[PDB]
């Protein structure tokens, strides 16, 4: 049960006398009992990586074998909690230490064993029933919004012997008892799951329902879904924080798990300060977002081995809340700073790199994490249906599209929102490329649009065609200079400029363009494309007749119709409403129809 330290070099310890230790087991190193993980066996020597600082660890110190892998505790007390990569409560540590530091070997439990939770069992369960893994056997009222379903661990089954009456219990009180084969087993409100081990489901279903970000360029041209995998770049000022906060304030998610992997210490203080201040509107009332949010916090100076366990902690919390029947949306910021830790740990073990120093198993570890997202039919007796949507921020090492992390990621994800540096230099936000970005969900979303917004797909198609034709013409107008241009090219240019400046371009720091609902998006695009069609038809039919129509005698006639289009983005979906905005757009459509009928 006790080995001894034999060598120490960096975060890697070598311990002798470790006979039956298993790989990836957890151990306690030294007199401070620092947690560590077995990453190599040889004879009866074991190689451990330590999740703390190893300064001052002598040769001969004890090493205690725990017998279990790296796990998380899952129970009531996760909504509103701030952890690190190992699920250590950063607020309980400060409250109990009364200090501004995190001690070494600090051993405090992730969920407080002191709070009394209001637990009511299920009505039809009773002594003698048959229960299996996944079944919901109680409900704890965690707060005003989130109801915490108490489930059975997925590897248990039996007949009920005792189940607790409604009341107030803490996470140490026994609530259920099962008998399988004459053996007995008691269950409390908390379970324990290994973070590197995926959680079972009944079935994985296809993703068919959108995930509204609020941005027009992403909701229209490059949609995400509930259960999708997305990759954005980590770029300051481009509009990434807008997305991170929009996922939380105004979306269709129930739970939000935000993971920071390698985080500038002054950019994590911002997140930790102004997340407890954000609010959202539910049933008229205004309620804090920290009632349905959990943060995993990891900065760039914490141990390297705790940097790579952050992603797993976050995705396991996500799966735990998915198995209740909720829709979770995880944000994993700086997947690149996670790959950096992978590379460093690989180097410390003297392994052969593959490309640019990275381990050869880089794609195999990114896939194992991205492929845990999806829409599922939850395991257990009540028919549920959950989903986890992962968004990963892959920062560039200068802006290369063939970084090993970026090229390994593009083989796995279904949506890619690209970064345009030329657009971020001209202060066009959000700086989405819209010519290299892609989404592979635009065919699974078809029967949703064909049922709710039945006229949107042609608008999207034509908008994309216009935006590509403009790019074709741009590097022609650059050299020659727009003298000899067909009138249809003039209309293409001057409608593409409208689409770029008034539809794709958005300002998240204003009280009307913070979250743009989808009826607003569809209405703006519909009016713009209707104008394009009308102008093109007018100029095309009277081509060889008398009084040749041109783009210049269109900007004369309808100069204020070209202003209600360039100002559709100022309507407000909370000062105005849905029917008011729809009426305005319909009136503008009739106006431009009358103008094009009169001029022609």
């Amino acid at each position: 049960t006790f080995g001894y330290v034999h060598g120490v070099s960096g975060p890697v310890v070598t311990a002798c006398d470790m006979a039956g230790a298993a790989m990836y087991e957890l151990v306690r190193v030294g007199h401070s009992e620092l947690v560590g993980e077995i990453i190599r066996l040889e004879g009866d020597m074991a190689t451990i990586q330590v999740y703390e600082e190893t300064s001052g660890v002598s040769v001969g110190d004890p090493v205690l074998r725990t017998g279990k892998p790296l796990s998380v505790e899952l129970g009531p007390g996760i909504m509103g909690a701030i952890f690190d990569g190992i699920q250590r409560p950063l607020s309980d540590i400060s409250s109990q230490t009364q200090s501004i530091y995190i001690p070494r070997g600090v051993n405090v439990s992730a969920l407080s064993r002191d709070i009394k939770w209001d637990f009511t069992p299920c009505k039809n369960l009773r002594v003698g029933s048959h229960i299996t893994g996944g079944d919901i056997y109680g409900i704890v009222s965690e707060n005003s919004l989130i109801k915490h379903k108490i489930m059975l661990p997925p590897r248990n089954r039996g007949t009920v012997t005792y189940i607790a009456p409604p009341g107030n219990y803490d996470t140490s009180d026994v609530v259920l008892e099962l008998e399988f084969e004459g053996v007995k087993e008691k269950f409390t409100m908390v379970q324990v799951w290994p973070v590197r081990q995926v959680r079972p489901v009944t079935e994985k279903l296809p993703a068919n329902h959108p995930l509204l970000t609020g941005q027009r360029v992403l909701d229209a041209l490059f949609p995400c879904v509930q259960g999708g995998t997305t990759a954005i770049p980590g770029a300051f000022g481009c509009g990434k924080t807008v997305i991170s906060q929009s996922l939380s304030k105004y979306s269709n998610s129930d739970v939000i798990i935000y993971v920071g992997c390698g985080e500038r210490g002054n950019e994590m203080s911002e997140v930790l300060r102004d997340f407890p201040e954000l609010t959202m509107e539910v049933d008229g009332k205004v309620e804090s977002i920290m009632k349905r949010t959990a943060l995993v916090a990891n900065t760039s100076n914490m141990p390297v081995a705790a940097r790579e366990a952050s992603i797993y902690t976050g995705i396991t919390l996500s799966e735990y809340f998915r198995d209740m029947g909720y829709h979770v949306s995880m944000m994993a910021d700086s997947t690149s700073r996670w790959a950096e830790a992978l590379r460093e740990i690989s180097g410390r073990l003297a392994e052969m790199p593959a490309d640019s120093g990275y381990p050869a198993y880089l794609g195999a570890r990114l896939a194992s994490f991205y492929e845990r997202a999806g829409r599922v039919k939850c395991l257990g007796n009540p028919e549920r249906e959950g989903s986890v949507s992962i968004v990963g921020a892959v920062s560039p090492p200068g802006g290369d599209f063939s970084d090993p992390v970026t090229s390994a990621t593009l083989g796995i994800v279904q949506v890619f929102w690209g970064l345009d540096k030329k657009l971020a230099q001209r202060k066009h936000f959000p700086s989405v490329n819209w010519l290299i970005s892609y989404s592979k969900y635009m065919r699974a979303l078809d029967e949703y649009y064909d049922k709710h917004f039945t006229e949107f797909v042609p608008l999207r198609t034509k908008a994309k065609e216009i935006l590509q034709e403009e790019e074709d013409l741009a590097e022609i107008v650059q050299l020659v200079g727009k003298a000899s241009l067909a009138e249809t090219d003039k209309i293409t240019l001057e409608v593409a400029k409208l689409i770029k400046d008034d539809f794709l371009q958005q300002n998240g720091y204003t009280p009307y363009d913070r979250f743009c609902p989808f009826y607003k998006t569809v209405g703006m695009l519909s009016n713009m494309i209707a104008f394009y069609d009308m102008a093109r038809r007018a100029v095309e039919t009277t081509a060889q007749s008398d009084n040749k129509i041109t783009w210049s005698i269109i900007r004369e006639h309808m100069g204020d119709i070209l202003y209600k289009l360039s100002s559709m983005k100022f309507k407000d979906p909370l000062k105005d409403g849905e029917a008011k905005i729809k009426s305005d757009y319909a009136q503008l459509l009739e106006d431009m129809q009358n103008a094009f009928r009169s001029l022609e």
Partner: protein
């Protein structure tokens, strides 16, 4: 001329308050050296043999 005048008087005033600080130091030291000498000589003359805690008998 004004600079050549002030150059010396400023130096003498600084050398005055220096001596003031040094007398304060010495009057602090005279009234406290014996207690700290007792504490030091009791720490030095108190021996406690010990083996490393990592030693396996």
């Amino acid at each position: 001329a004004a600079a050549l005048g002030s150059r010396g008087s400023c130096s003498t005033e600084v050398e005055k308050e220096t001596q003031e600080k040094m007398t304060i130091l010495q009057t602090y030291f005279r009234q406290n050296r014996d207690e700290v000498l007792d504490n030091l000589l009791a720490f030095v003359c108190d021996i406690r043999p010990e083996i490393h805690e990592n030693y396996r008998i």
